[PDB]
């Protein structure tokens, strides 16, 4: 909830280019994002839609 | 240090528009956004060196 929206996006250290999206403060609204597969954050979101449901 | 270096750059609530440097984890070096003057986040420094020293 709304905290964890806040924290940079996370590619992490594995070598996967997954599409991922997260609260972006700036803009104000979910973007994308490539996630490795493993580590980074709370603010990982599979789609745009769930993205917005819980940070939108 | 460490922990507060991975909050996303918070330009907050208040009016103002004041150079201000935050450690990008993506880029793995300080950039500069806008602050306006209260509220936002640990991630704020008024120069590259101290957001450096803090992050880098």
Same mark, same amino acid.
């Given at each position: 909830?709304?905290?964890?929206?806040?924290?940079? +996006?996370?590619?992490?250290?594995?070598?996967?280019?997954?599409? *991922?999206?997260? &609260? $972006?403060?700036? !803009?104000?609204?979910? +973007?994308?994002?490539?996630?490795?597969?493993?580590?980074?954050? *709370?603010?990982? &979101? $599979?789609?745009? !839609?769930?993205?917005? +449901?819980?940070?939108?």
């Amino acid at each position: 909830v709304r905290e964890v929206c806040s924290e940079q +996006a996370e590619t992490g250290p594995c070598r996967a280019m997954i599409s *991922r999206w997260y &609260f $972006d403060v700036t !803009e104000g609204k979910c +973007a994308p994002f490539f996630y490795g597969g493993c580590g980074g954050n *709370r603010n990982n &979101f $599979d789609t745009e !839609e769930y993205c917005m +449901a819980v940070c939108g």
